[PDB]
């Protein structure tokens, strides 16, 4: 079985006591057949740090961008354009909109989200979209900025089936995290059933949202294995089938050679 954790904050894990270092994390992941990860940075300075921390690895790819919640300090789109063109970067983001802690940065959040899409369009790399309490503004921007030009994934999906449908209509992929195993998450379980297999992805969004049976513990990439089994159960398929379909979807969306996503040889 070959699983991909499509969204994890490798620079945010506990390397003090939980893990020895990145090697350790990835080996723990490989032990549960999680053999590839997409490492996510939240700002440009943190992206630079992430590349140095992680180094050059065969089973890790990166996003480059500025999170919706990190829009108080300005940044130069020109730096985003340059850094996103680096080898290793397969996506723009995570970008999107988050109005939960809305101190009125939505105008800056929008401007940034628009730039991330533009750069994705320019480099033919998709956008990783984070959205929260900002449904209408998110779809408005996705449709208006022609995200269909570069493609993308609604990462850590927490909306409803109707919303999933509008996103699917734009070619989008929908990734589910451990939140889908939460007691209060029926709405998500409902969306999980609806999303076609060929548009599904899974992730942990580590270190947050550890899934059952590990709630209360720091999340780690290996746990995408539980997310996957859970989704398989909900979708009515074997985890090996979900693992191969989601890994094939990952390869298509992020333009990754299938050979890098297999364990033969």
Nearer to Zn ion, 91 or 200 (CB): 91
- Strand, helix or coil at 5? strand
Q: How far is the CB of 129 from Zn ion (least distance, A)?
A: 8
Nearer to Zn ion, 179 or 239 (CB): 179
Q: How far is the CB of 38 from Zn ion (least distance, A)?
A: 10
Nearer to Zn ion, 29 or 239 (CB): 29
Q: For 39, phi and psi rounded to 5 degrees? A: -80, 125
H or E stretch covering 186: helix 186-194
Nearer to Zn ion, 6 or 246 (CB): 6
CA-closest candidate to residue 155, choices 248, 46, 30, 63: 63
In this chain, which residue has its C-beta nearest to Zn ion?
130
Nearer to Zn ion, 224 or 239 (CB): 224
What number of other Cβ atoms are within 10 A of residue 57's Cβ?
15
What span, in angstroms and rounded, lies between the C-alpha atoms of 100 and 131?
10
Q: How far is the CB of 94 from Zn ion (least distance, A)?
A: 5
What span, in angstroms and rounded, lies between the C-alpha atoms of 118 and 166?
21
Q: How far is the CB of 14 from Zn ion (least distance, A)?
A: 16
Is 115 annotated in a binding site? The answer is no
Nearer to Zn ion, 219 or 246 (CB): 219
Q: For 36, phi and psi rounded to 5 degrees? A: -160, 145
Task: Judge whether 32 and 63 are in contact, CB under 8 Å.
Answer: no
Is 155 annotated in a binding site? The answer is yes
CA-closest candidate to residue 92, choices 71, 74, 77: 77
Instruction: Give the residues lining the site for Zn ion (CB under 5 A).
Output: 94, 130, 205
Is 130 annotated in a binding site? The answer is yes
In the block, tokens 């992929």 appear at 173
Nearer to Zn ion, 205 or 229 (CB): 205
Task: Judge whether 253 and 151 are in contact, CB under 8 Å.
Answer: yes
Is 116 annotated in a binding site? The answer is no
What span, in angstroms and rounded, lies between the C-alpha atoms of 181 and 44?
32
- Strand, helix or coil at 183? coil
Q: How far is the CB of 202 from Zn ion (least distance, A)?
A: 14
- Distances 12 to 23, 211, 230, 237 between C-alpha atoms, Å: 15, 17, 25, 32
Q: How far is the CB of 133 from Zn ion (least distance, A)?
A: 13
Q: How far is the CB of 91 from Zn ion (least distance, A)?
A: 12
List the binding residues.
7, 9, 94, 130, 155, 205
List the binding residues for a divalent metal cation.
7, 9, 94, 130, 155, 205
């Amino acid at each position: 079985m070959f699983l991909v954790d499509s969204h994890c904050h490798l620079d945010g894990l506990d390397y003090e006591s939980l893990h020895k270092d990145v090697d350790d994390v990835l080996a723990k992941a490989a032990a549960r057949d999680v053999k590839f990860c997409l490492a996510v940075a939240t700002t440009l300075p943190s992206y630079l740090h992430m590349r140095d921390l992680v180094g050059e690895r065969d089973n890790v790819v990166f996003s480059c961008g500025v999170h919706p919640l990190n829009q108080n300090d300005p940044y130069d789109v020109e730096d985003l354009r340059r850094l996103a063109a680096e080898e290793g970067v397969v996506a723009l983001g995570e970008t999107g909109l988050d109005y939960y802690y809305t101190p009125e940065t939505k105008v800056r959040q929008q401007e940034s989200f628009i730039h991330h899409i533009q750069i994705g369009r320019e480099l033919n790399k998709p956008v990783i979209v984070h959205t929260r309490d900002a449904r209408a503004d998110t779809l408005a921007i996705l449709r208006e900025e022609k995200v269909t030009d570069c493609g993308g994934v609604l990462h850590c999906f927490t909306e409803d089936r109707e919303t999933a449908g509008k996103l699917l209509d734009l070619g989008f992929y929908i990734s589910f995290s451990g939140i889908v195993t939460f007691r209060n998450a029926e709405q998500l379980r409902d969306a999980a059933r609806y999303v076609p297999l060929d548009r599904l992805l899974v992730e942990t969004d580590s270190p947050y949202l550890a899934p059952v049976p590990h709630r209360g513990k720091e999340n780690q990439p290996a746990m995408v294995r539980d997310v996957a089994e859970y989704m398989a159960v909900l979708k009515g398929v074997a985890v090996e089938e979900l693992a191969q379909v989601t890994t094939d979807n990952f390869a298509r969306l992020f333009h990754i050679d299938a050979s890098r996503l297999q364990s033969i040889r």
